[PDB]
Every structure is written in structure tokens, then in C-alpha cells.
Amino acid sequence: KTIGVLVPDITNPFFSTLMRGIEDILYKQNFVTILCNADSIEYLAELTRRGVDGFIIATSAVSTDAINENLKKQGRPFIVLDQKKSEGFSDAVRTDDFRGGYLAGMHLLSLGHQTIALVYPENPPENVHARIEGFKSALDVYQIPHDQLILLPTQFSKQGGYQITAELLDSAATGVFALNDELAFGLYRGLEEAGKSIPEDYSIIGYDNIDMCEYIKPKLTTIAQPIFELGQTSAKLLLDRIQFPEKEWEEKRLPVRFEKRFSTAPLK
Amino acid sequence: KTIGVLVPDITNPFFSTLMRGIEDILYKQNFVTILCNADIEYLAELTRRGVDGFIIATSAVSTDAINENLKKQGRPFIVLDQKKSEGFSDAVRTDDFRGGYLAGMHLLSLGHQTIALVYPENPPENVHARIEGFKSALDVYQIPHDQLILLPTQFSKQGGYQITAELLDSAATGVFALNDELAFGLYRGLEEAGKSIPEDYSIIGYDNIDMCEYIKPKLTTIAQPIFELGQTSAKLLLDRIQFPEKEWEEKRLPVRFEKRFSTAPLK
Ligand SMILES: OC[C@H]1O[C@H](O)[C@H](O)[C@@H]1O
Numbered sequence: 001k002t003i004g005v006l007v008p009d010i011t012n013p014f015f016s017t018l019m020r021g022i023e024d025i026l027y028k029q030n031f032v033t034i035l036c037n038a039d040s041i042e043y044l045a046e047l048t049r050r051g052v053d054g055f056i057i058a059t060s061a062v063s064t065d066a067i068n069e070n071l072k073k074q075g076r077p078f079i080v081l082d083q084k085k086s087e088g089f090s091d092a093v094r095t096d097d098f099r100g101g102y103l104a105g106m107h108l109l110s111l112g113h114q115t116i117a118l119v120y121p122e123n124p125p126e127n128v129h130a131r132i133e134g135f136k137s138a139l140d141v142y143q144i145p146h147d148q149l150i151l152l153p154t155q156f157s158k159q160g161g162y163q164i165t166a167e168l169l170d171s172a173a174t175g176v177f178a179l180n181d182e183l184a185f186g187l188y189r190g191l192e193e194a195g196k197s198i199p200e201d202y203s204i205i206g207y208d209n210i211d212m213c214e215y216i217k218p219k220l221t222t223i224a225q226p227i228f229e230l231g232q233t234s235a236k237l238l239l240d241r242i243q244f245p246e247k248e249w250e251e252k253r254l255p256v257r258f259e260k261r262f263s264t265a266p267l268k
Numbered sequence: 269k270t271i272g273v274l275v276p277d278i279t280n281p282f283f284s285t286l287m288r289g290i291e292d293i294l295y296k297q298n299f300v301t302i303l304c305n306a307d308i309e310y311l312a313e314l315t316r317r318g319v320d321g322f323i324i325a326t327s328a329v330s331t332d333a334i335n336e337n338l339k340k341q342g343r344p345f346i347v348l349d350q351k352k353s354e355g356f357s358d359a360v361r362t363d364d365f366r367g368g369y370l371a372g373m374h375l376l377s378l379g380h381q382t383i384a385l386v387y388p389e390n391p392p393e394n395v396h397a398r399i400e401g402f403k404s405a406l407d408v409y410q411i412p413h414d415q416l417i418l419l420p421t422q423f424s425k426q427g428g429y430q431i432t433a434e435l436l437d438s439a440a441t442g443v444f445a446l447n448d449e450l451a452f453g454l455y456r457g458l459e460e461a462g463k464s465i466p467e468d469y470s471i472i473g474y475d476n477i478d479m480c481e482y483i484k485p486k487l488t489t490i491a492q493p494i495f496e497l498g499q500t501s502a503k504l505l506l507d508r509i510q511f512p513e514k515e516w517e518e519k520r521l522p523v524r525f526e527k528r529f530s531t532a533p534l535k
């Protein structure tokens with residue numbers, strides 16, 4: 001009666017809210033939900049030995065080999081999502097990353113920003129990469145040369161956003177796409193400390209719509225993933241797989257949406 | 269080789285940072301750390317799964333469940349935070365009474381005499397100790413226990429947000445929020461009501477989670493040594509596993525005042 005959830009980063013509200021959505025569904029079927037913070041030790045092997053019944057895997061740190069050796073051999077069904085690539089004989093839930101990046105780009109470009117900084121994790125996971133590709137598709141619509149993107153790779157965290165502020169200030173960028181909300185919060189701090197204002201000096205759009213977006217000032221404009229629902233959907237898929245081992249293999253895709261708040265403005 | 273960490277609220281950065289401190293130590297001894305959000309039979313199920321030891325930060329795990337599952341099956345455990353002490357366990361605590369006292373003394377030194385307490389309804393004992401410490405400070409300044417504006421709410425950003433209207437028509441000029449998440453709720457509520465911090469309200473929070481340094485003004489707060497708390501809890505458990513008959517310990521770690529920019533002298 002135990003389901004294991006493997007995430008890249010439990011300190012990110014995205015993954016704790018994901019967990020809450022999972023728990024919301026599993027609790028009703030008397031499953032215990034446990035969470036592992038697995039980034040880049042044999043998590044799967046140990047948890048499989050402990051008799052964990054099924055897994056929900058959101059991290060790329062869990063390899064195909066580890067899944068084959070432990071989950072498949074021992075008949076433990078699993079769901080993949082988020083940073084984890086698809087696997088044979090698993091169900092998946094994904095959100096529309098390409099679309100979300102496209103929406104972010106189109107918003108900044110509609111406001112007249114033409115020199116734009118991209119704040120993103122060095123060596124991004126594939127879902128994050130797809131956001132960047134969608135953003136570049138928006139640049140193509142506006143015929144912005146891809147080398148007018150100011151690339152600001154950093155650590156995927158508030159601290160990482162904070163640390164690239166000096167580079168942002170030394171660039172000609174007027175708008176910023178932060179590849180998650182945590183990165184954006186880092187930028188807020190850096191810009192505040194440098195005596196700058198949002199949106200007067202910089203338009204910023206983030207990604208996820210974690211709750212904190214509504215508690216900072218100005219409130220952060222962002223691409224909303226349906227985070228809680230993503231967790232619920234992953235849990236429902238797993239319960240259905242446990243109840244119906246031979247049901248159709250599914251790769252569900254949930255939409256994102258633009259959440260317009262007060263961290264962007266037309267370029268003057 | 270698996271250790272179970274039971275927390276009351278994984279969405280609170282306090283508990284995810286706690287977890288990171290625990291992992292930091294356990295990882296080095298090749299232990300797998302798993303986390304449960306517990307506020308059904310967690311212990312019974314995880315004990316059956318062969319979880320080797322537990323770190324229990326939630327009061328939602330009962331003495332009976334511990335006896336029936338952990339003690340019977342020889343699984344050592346550590347208690348902390350919201351969880352009360354248990355026989356034949358080690359504990360690590362932070363100085364809650366002191367922290368509340370520091371918060372009260374700070375607001376009172378600034379001239380605030382009508383103060384609001386924003387706290388969780390049905391507070392756990394550690395949070396109650398903070399409130400008692402705060403009241404001790406009010407005693408030093410001979411503030412009746414009356415003026416104190418009592419604003420119980422849900423233990424969350426949303427809870428802090430939702431008691432803002434109650435705060436606004438009180439005579440309070442200073443606020444002690446019983447954690448940083450509650451304080452963030454107040455920021456949002458006060459901003460939307462067109463108020464300023466600290467010009468209209470002095471606010472002091474509790475925990476010193478990372479976000480305190482990313483909001484504006486930066487939040488004045490009582491720091492718990494969160495990461496170190498997790499590390500200490502993990503070290504105690506490993507020592508108990510290596511030395512089952514070592515001294516039973518109740519470690520207590522200090523708190524400290526983090527003065528930032530969300531308070532100011534009353535004008
Ligand atoms: O915010 C954390 C990011 O990493 C994950 O991949 C999530 O999709 C989220 O956007």
C-alpha cells in the first residue's frame with residue numbers, strides 16, 4: 001500500500017505542490033505516499049526491496065537501467081512526467097512546455113521588447129529545453145535574430161537567479177524570461193538590491209505559477225502549469241494501472257496558460 | 269538502509285530545508301531518506317516495508333502507533349519540532365520560548381504597545397511555547413494580556429493573507445507572525461490594502477526560511493538553525509543505530525534574532 005514519488009528538488013514549491021496533488025488522490029485509496037529527493041545512491045533498488053508498490057518519477061536522475069532492473073523485473077508499475085523521459089510500458093503525464101515558452105515569448109515581444117534575456121538552468125532538462133524552443137519560435141515570428149537573446153545560464157534556484165543579476169544589468173536586455181518562478185524571485189532580489197524597479201527597468205515573466213507569485217510585489221506574470229492537477233493525474237493513472245494492468249498505455253498532456261500580472265510593461 | 273522522515277507540512281520551506289539537512293548526513297552513510305507528509309497508518313505501513321528508523325516532526329503520529337510499530341519492531345526514532353517526547357527516543361529541539369521572547373522584546377523596544385499575534389489555530393506545543401515566550405516579554409513591559417490582538421488562522425501564506433482585514437481595523441501597530449509563511453500572507457494582504465511595511469505595520473516572523481531575503485522589505489525574523497536541525501536529527505539517529513545503548517539525549521539548539529527591514533520605531 002505504498003507509492004514512491006521521485007522528484008529532482010523537494011525545496012521547489014512546484015514539487016511539493018505536485019506531491020500534494022498526488023497525495024490527494026492516493027489518500028482516498030488508503031495508499032501511503034512517500035517522497036524521495038533524487039538529483040545528480042540506488043533509490044529504486046532500495047525502495048523496490050522495501051516492497052514499494054508503484055512509483056511516480058519526475059526526475060531524469062532515475063535511469064532506464066535502474067527502472068528495468070528493479071521496477072520491471074519486480075512488476076512495480078510507474079508513471080513518468082516532468083524531467084523524466086518516456087519509458088516503454090509506463091504511462092506519462094506532461095504539460096505543454098513548447099506552448100508555454102511560446103506564450104512567454106509572444107507576450108514580451110507584443111510589449112515591444114526586442115533584446116531579451118533568458119535565465120535558465122545550465123544543461124536544462126528536456127522539458128525546460130522545450131520551453132526554450134517554444135520561446136525561440138516566438139522570436140522567429142518577430143524575426144528576432146536568435147543571437148539577440150542574452151543567454152544567462154545559472155543554477156536552477158532563487159540563488160541562481162540572484163547571482164546572474166549583475167550579468168543582466170550589464171546587458172542591453174529590457175525583458176526577461178525566467179525558466180521558473182524561483183529564478184524570477186532571485187532576479188527580483190538582485191534588482192531590488194541594485195536600486196532597480198520591476199517593471200519600469202525590467203519586464204520579467206516566470207514559469208510555473210507557484211503560489212508565491214501572488215505574494216511578491218509586483219505580482220509575477222508567469223506561465224501557469226496546472227501543478228496540483230498534474231499530481232492528481234499522475235496518481236489517478238497509477239491507480240488505474242494497478243487496478244487494470246493491461247489498460248491502454250497513456251501519455252496525457254495538460255495545457256498551460258498565461259497568467260498576466262504586474263511584472264511586465266510596454267517598452268518605452 | 270531506509271530512514272523515514274515524517275513532517276506535518278512538506279509545502280512549508282522549513283520542512284523541505286529540514287529534509288535537506290537530514291539527507292546531507294544520511295547520504296554519506298548510504299542511507300535512503302524518504303519523506304511522508306502526515307497531518308491513515310503511516311508507521312504501520314512503513315514499518316511493514318522494513319523502514320529501519322524514523323525522524324518524527326509531526327504530532328499526528330501517536331504514542332500508541334509508535335509503541336505498536338516502532339518499539340515492538342526495534343526501529344529507533346528521533347522526535348523533534350511538533351512531536352512530543354517519547355520514552356527511549358532521542359530528541360532535538362530549538363528554543364521556542366526564547367524566540368518568542370526575543371520577538372516580543374524587539375517589538376516592545378520599538379514602542380509598539382498594541383500588538384497582533386498571527387498564529388495557527390490549535391497550535392502545536394512548540395508554537396505555543398513561542399507564544400508563552402512572547403507573553404513573558406509583554407509581562408516585562410506590563411502590557412496587559414488584553415490589548416494583545418489575537419488573530420488565529422490557517423498555518424500558511426493563505427491563512428496570513430486571510431486575517432489581514434481583521435488586522436486592519438484593530439489598533440495594532442506591530443505584528444508577530446508565528447512563522448514566515450504567515451508573515452508573507454500579511455505582506456500580500458497589506459500591499460493589496462495600500463498599506464506599507466514598516467510604515468504602517470512592523471512585522472516580525474519566525475524561522476528565517478530563505479524567502480525572507482527575497483521579499484521587500486526583507487523580513488525581520490527569529491532564525492531557527494533549520495538545516496543544522498535536520499543534520500543533528502540525522503546524526504542522533506545514526507549514533508543510536510551504531511550504539512543502541514548510548515545516552516538518551518534531548519539536544520536543544522539556539523535561535524537568533526535576524527534584524528532586517530520589516531520593523532521600525534513607532535511614530
Ligand atoms: O520549477 C521547477 C521546474 O523544474 C521542473 O521540471 C518543473 O516543470 C518546474 O518548472
Ligand SMILES: OC[C@H]1O[C@H](O)[C@H](O)[C@@H]1O
Nearest residue numbers: 280282349350394447475
Ligand atoms: O514554519 C513551520 C513551523 O511549523 C513547525 O513547527 C516549525 O518549527 C516552523 O516554525
Ligand SMILES: [Cl-]
Nearest residue numbers: 013017210211
Ligand atoms: Cl504552489
Ligand SMILES: [Cl-]
Nearest residue numbers: 013210211212
Ligand atoms: Cl509557493
Ligand SMILES: [Cl-]
Nearest residue numbers: 216217483484
Ligand atoms: Cl516582495
Ligand SMILES: [Cl-]
Nearest residue numbers: 226227228229
Ligand atoms: Cl492545478
Ligand SMILES: [Cl-]
Nearest residue numbers: 226227228229
Ligand atoms: Cl496548482
Ligand SMILES: [Cl-]
Nearest residue numbers: 244245246247
Ligand atoms: Cl486490465
Ligand SMILES: [Cl-]
Nearest residue numbers: 484485486529
Ligand atoms: Cl529590504
Ligand SMILES: [Cl-]
Nearest residue numbers: 511512513514
Ligand atoms: Cl551501545
